[PDB]
Every structure is written in C-alpha cells, then in structure tokens.
Amino acid sequence: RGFFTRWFMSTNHKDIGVLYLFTGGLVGLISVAFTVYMRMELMAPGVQFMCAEHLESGLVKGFFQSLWPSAVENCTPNGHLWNVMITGHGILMMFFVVIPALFGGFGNYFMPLHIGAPDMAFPRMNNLSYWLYVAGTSLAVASLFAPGGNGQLGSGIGWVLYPPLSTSESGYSTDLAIFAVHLSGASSILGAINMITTFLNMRAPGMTMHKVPLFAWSIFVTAWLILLALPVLAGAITMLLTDRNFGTTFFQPSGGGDPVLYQHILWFFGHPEVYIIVLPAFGIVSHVIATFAKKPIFGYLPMVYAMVAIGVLGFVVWAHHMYTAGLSLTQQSYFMMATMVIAVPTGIKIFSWIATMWGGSIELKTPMLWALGFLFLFTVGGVTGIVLSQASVDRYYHDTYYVVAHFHYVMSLGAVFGIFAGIYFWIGKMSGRQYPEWAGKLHFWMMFVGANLTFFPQHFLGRQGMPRRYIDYPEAFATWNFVSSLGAFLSFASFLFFLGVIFYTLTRGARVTANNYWNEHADTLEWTLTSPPPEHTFEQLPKREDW
C-alpha cells in the first residue's frame, strides 16, 4: 500500500469514488470562491473591484488589490474580468464539481455495493476515468492563465461557448477550455460504459432489475444519458475548434454557416446534462427518506419508471434554451409543449417522497434535513422552469436574472442538497468516524438561510429587467443585489464551516464500530459490511436472504 500505489494506480472502486469526492470538493471551493468575487463586485453599483489599472501590476501584485475596493472615479471598468469569472464558475461547476461527486464519487463507491458486486466490471478503465477528469480540470484551469480575449488572459465567453464570440475571441485560452470539455466528456463516457456493464452483468444472484436499490437505478439512467449525449457535444465543440484553427466556417455566415445550428447541437447535450446532475440526487434522496422515516420507499416501480420517463424526455426538449435565438412558431410550440411533460414524471417522484414520510415515524437527523430542504427548494426551482418553459413568458425572462434563480434553486438548493445529504449519511460508512449531529444541523440551517437570501432576490431583479452576465448595472437594482451578495457571503461561510466539520471528523470524529449506525430501515447491502468496508467487498457473494 505505498501511498503512490494506493491512490496513483487505483483499481478499487471505493477509493476511486473517494478520489472523485475530494477532487470535486476541491474544485467546488475554488469555483465557489469565484462566486464570492462576483458577489463582492455586484454588491454595489459601479465597478469598484474589477478595474483595468490592475493589469499593469504583475499578477501576484494586482491580485491582492482586487480583494479591496476602489473608488468609481479611479476604477476603470474591465468587463473581461467579469466575463472570465462568470465562465470559470459555469465550466468548473457543470463539468468539474457536481457530476464527478454525485456520479463518480457516490456512484462508483456505492452503486456496486448496492447490487452485491465484488468490484466494477472494468477496474483499470475506471481509474483512467478518474485521471482524465484531472487532465480536463487542469486544462480548464490552465486556461485562466493563458492568452485570451482582449489582450488579457482567460476566455470570457459563456460556459456554453457560443459563436461567433467563441470563434473570434483571440488567444488560445478558449482552445484549452475546448479540450478540457473534451477530456471531461471522455471521463464521463468511460465511467458511463463501466456503470452500464457492471449493473446489468454484475448483480448478485436473485437480484432482478426490479429488485435493485433506487440509488443504483438513478446512476443507471444517469449513465445512459451521458453515453448518448456527450458524443454529440464532442462534435459541436470540434466544430468550434476547426473554425478557429483551420478556418472552417460551420457557424460563420460569410461561408454559409449558422450560429443557431451550434445552439441546437450544444443544447441537445445541454439539456441531458441538467437531468444528469439531478438524477443521482433523486436516488440518494430515496435512500435518506426510507431510512429516516423508517419505512419502505412508496411506489418503487413508478419511481423507477419516473426516472426513465425524465431521461428519455430530456433528449427531445432542447430548443427551450433557444426561444429568442430565431425559431419558427412551430418549433416554439413543439419545444414548449414537450418540455411541459417532464412535470408529470417529477411530480410523481415528489409525491412519493411526501407519501413515504406519511405513515412512518420520522427521525430528523442531519441527513434528513437536506432531503426535506431539497424536497422544497427543488419544487421552488422546478415551478420556475414551467414558467420558463412557456415561450411567451420566456421572452421577458430570457437572459435576465429570473433564469439564474431558476437554475440555482434546482442546482444549488437541489442537487447540491443531495451532495450533502449523501455526505452526512455515508461519512462513517466510508471513514470509520461519524460526524457531530450539532455542527451538521448548524451547517444545514446556515446554508438554507444564506442560500435562500442569495438567490430569492434575483427572481425580483429578473422581473425588473436585469440582464445576465453584466459586471455593472443601473441604480435601480442596488437594493436586492445587496441582499443577494450578503446571502452569498453567508453561504460561503457555511461551506467553510462544513470543511472544518469534515476535517475535524476525519481527525477526531467518533470512532464508528457498528455495521449500521442509523437504524433497521437502512436496508441495503452497504450496511451489512464494516464501517470502514473491507478492501475487497464481496469475495463471498451476498446470500439471497442476507438482505
């Protein structure tokens, strides 16, 4: 077990999942801090922080000055800094923070246990997924420091990279970001194939596909959508790359190209991505609700089929992100109508959750607070979408902050809630050291409060016309930006608490000695093993009655 042997040449799925967690955790903070930057800068009108005069100073110099206010009068509005920040967030988050933790951390480690499988079908190839996730991250980060738009560093384009701004932007910044997304898509497809052979081939005797945990089913559907969606994004971004370095003209009108066709092929993967993020969150919620309500998950088949209902609809509603880009009315109706249908599937899931709780005795442990938060905030987030699904209302809402609040409710108060739900719920199982019920509660309360302040205000701003991706705004939008900004520092405080809570725990945390430290209602095969689990779980296959 040389340290190099263990983590650098890994073949075990439970250490590869631990790698993706911390890794995703890392990049989440990094990304997370860029958000404080933005919120400092948006707290108040005029540009105080992102000044053009800080470019003269080396980077080591100007940096530190940027964490301190300047007067409007002496502040020279450098819009590009803003644009680069907003896009490091977006790209880090959607490719390098949340899918990796929720899919490759809690899915690699646990999906296998839940089905009663020795390991993962293709161990070597899994470790290769982990390391190509690093390459992409690396390339994407490197990008912030390389030659990019307007003689400064960094590609301030959008996390979706639309041309012809993406093609015409100078430097090679956007080339590194282009290939970062490529590696992350290989990452995801290798992971996707592995989880698909494993689940249908490596289940324990007598475990029929209708006898599999829902957490594992959610990684199954997630993994399908990746497989069918990332390859389509390898192509739209290969068309950006060629048009920039080989003077092709896919989305260049002077040669007969069409910027809009880019938007179709990007969103045909840009929709499947958002269900790829929240699928796993729905699976961890089940577990946490069954466990802590001390009762069987209500409507198990309809939960499994709701899952497949979403992922399948997820591939036919992608022009909802293009209502104002120039589409036919027919196109606008097909896509509005089609998007509305995902509401059935999700509701069924939401009701079944309330139902499971109904009739059982509930234990409000830390892990359940998140699950309940998520029940609420994902619905808040959800509704919004229906409003945004309406082509008509989207005119006004499109590209204003009313969308930014959408997506953060169902991402930051949604799938993120599922990232923490699973953290608190399975930290002992994977570490031998449980956490403090008290600090966990505090954290939860802190961040629900903070994060509601962060984005609830933005629904206002969006209704009041504030555009998306501005570094400055009118005088009439100050009020609510203060609030939001206050909110994000409150939430950033929390995330700091949580990393100390975690640090503490793995240092001085209660030694766990039981095989199930929760209750009898936590009925899946992970709870039948030590506490921290054997390095070769399931040499002896799970006897049919065992669970």
Binding site: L200, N201, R203, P205, M209, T330
Partner: protein, 42 residues
Amino acid sequence: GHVAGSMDITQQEKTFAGFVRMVTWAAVVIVAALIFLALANA
C-alpha cells in the same frame, strides 16, 4: 478454492438477450420517427 468458469451465468445471458432486443427496438423507433418528422415538417 479455485473453480474458474463454473459460476452460473443464466441470469446475465437472459439479460444480455433482452438488452440486445431493447436496443434494436429503440434504434428503429427513432429512425422511423426521424423519418416521420422529415415527411411531415421538413
């Protein structure tokens, strides 16, 4: 306790058999849909 190859693979073989059918079902359902669309609205 080596006995390489003697495990029971009945469930997996039946599973693969379904997998191969389900995929073909899918593929052809899309193509005829793609075609439908083409005819109706292209």
